């Protein structure tokens, strides 16, 4: 019932980027089908219907090309060549299907030098000095998770490719290929920094700029009761409205942007946040424009007063799920569909009328 | 030149994710107009067209409201109730272009208790249990920059939801509000650790995970001169790879699995790594499965092969910058134009017939 109803999906399972730019698509209302090799627990896997394919074979290629015959985009995130040697590259499915969105989810890109190897995020974000910008100055680099080279920089620019090439087609009535690399989305993921970089505002050293933790006022504080807050008070305003909450007088602390007295204001603002637990924080700044927020464990979050009145998660039989984003104001997003039974693939062609 | 060449773009001038989603739309090929208040030195300000108004007079609006009755999207990164009260909001745009889509970009949304609480990624993220899963388990939680609020859960949804609009509008003929929220578009970002939570395949104890540093074989390394490798080793094969690599025999080592003994494991792992430089591992892994990768800091990564040989970077102005992302084989994306000096608005109106 969102906005991309009536959008066909064939993918090709793999893993990281690809299901997550195909859950997403699926999410947002497009009619989306994953060939598997021959009922799911992954919530990932929700809003699909799954059939499965020997795709080695003479009938699950033909089975396949029927499929994608009749789909608008096909994501698959296989090693450069893989899906070529199958009979399901590029080239061969513009013979069935010259509208066809070709979406190609890798971390390395099509070509180059490092095309054929292996990896995974931590990879990808090593190379382009991502990694390196993460964690405390003093320690080596902590990975973000998978959330910057899998997803941000991955599965959402195969799906800005994807919807992009859609739009171009509106007027040009052919489809393209699209080559989704980790290592680049998640480059223009921080194209921030670059610019930054450029004109002496952010610096190579871990740790040591406004935005990495080296600022006391962009961190986390730990409270009396061990757990934490998160203060992002850059604009003096904010920042000031933080020192009131503390009760501190601003004329007996450094400078809010003297670098060189930062561990001394440090200092003074963890004794500040130290002297209470963290929910004492939540109270003293209420409706305030301090910046201060309690960082909530996954789960505690489904009791959070502003995460509960959006309806930002859903019960999914067993634990909370996010609901799709972004929202729509006329087309809404359904809640999704769990995995369900794997289904006959001739049942979807019929469907589809392929 | 690339797949949105045509699309016409009103951006009112924000921080954060709104110049980062007008960006890389421009990037992409659209027609970006940036609306100021009354050249740059910001590369994220590439692929523009800069105009200036005081949106709070009358001429600037009703030149403003010429402007976008002209466009196909407008992008507004302001609290909640800020474009209503200038006669820019959803409402009065619907009155002078019904196919308008209104991207609106925020942190907590378009409603609820928080939605007029100033705050930046950091918060946004702390809310939802991201930022909590975030550095090392004996340590506070570390910001993994701005990049997932702001950019993975903030502007790349701003961007999916446009495109799936835009979609949307070829079958209705007609736009609609896009309410993306950075709370809601990193929840959707991170659901791959909502879906593993509920299979007992994630916890809330920060660094004690697969893929946030609390497996050996999932994490960085220092090595002898005090820089780095990433080590992305996770499936059986590859591991092997890495362990061929460093001269070490399996036989000798606790199982990669085995959590009980992964001190044990990262304590054989770290000793290996310390004795040669992260140049010689880059070297002994630089064709292999093995998942390793030295880690390059910003200032070496102009100097890394495949990134050289793909063009992931251009030169700028004194400094490199991303080129677009993702790539498209038929109507690829020119170089981005830098940022250039402000322009008369009714320049862009006889342009764009206004
Ligand atoms: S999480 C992010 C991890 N990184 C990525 O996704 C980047 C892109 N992908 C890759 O680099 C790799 O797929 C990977 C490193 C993740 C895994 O490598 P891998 O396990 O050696 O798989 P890969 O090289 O992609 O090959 C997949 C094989 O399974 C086959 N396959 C896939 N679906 C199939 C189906 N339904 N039926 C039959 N075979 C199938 C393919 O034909 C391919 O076989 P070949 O090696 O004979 O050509
Ligand atoms: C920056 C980082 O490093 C990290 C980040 O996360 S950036 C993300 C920051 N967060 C967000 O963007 C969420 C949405 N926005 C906001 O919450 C807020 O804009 C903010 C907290 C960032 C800034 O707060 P603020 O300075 O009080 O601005 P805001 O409340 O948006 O109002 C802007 C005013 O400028 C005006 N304005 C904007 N463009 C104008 C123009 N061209 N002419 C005249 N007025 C203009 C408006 O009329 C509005 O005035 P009013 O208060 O009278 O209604």
Known sequence: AGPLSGLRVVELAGIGPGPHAAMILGDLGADVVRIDRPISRDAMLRNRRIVTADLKSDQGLELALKLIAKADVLIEGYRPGVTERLGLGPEECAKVNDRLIYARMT???????????????????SLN????????????????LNLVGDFGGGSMFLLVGILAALWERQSSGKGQV??????????????????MRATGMWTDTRGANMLDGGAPYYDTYECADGRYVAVGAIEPQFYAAMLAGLGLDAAELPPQNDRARWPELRAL?????????????????????????????????HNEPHIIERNTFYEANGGWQPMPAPRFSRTASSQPRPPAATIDIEAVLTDWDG
């Open 107 to 125: 971390g390395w890109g099509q070509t180059g030098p490092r095309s054929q190897q292996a990896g995974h995020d931590i990879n990808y974000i």
């Open 129 to 144: 000095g991502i990694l390196h910008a993460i964690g405390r100055g003093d320690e080596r680099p902590v990975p973000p």
């Open 178 to 195: 699209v080559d989704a690399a980790m290592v680049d989305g998640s480059s223009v993921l921080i194209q921030m920094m670059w610019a």
């Open 269 to 301: 603002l963890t004794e500040a946040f130290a002297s209470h637990d963290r929910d004492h924080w939540g109270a003293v700044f209420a409706n305030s424009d301090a910046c201060v927020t309690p960082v909530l464990a996954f789960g505690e979050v």
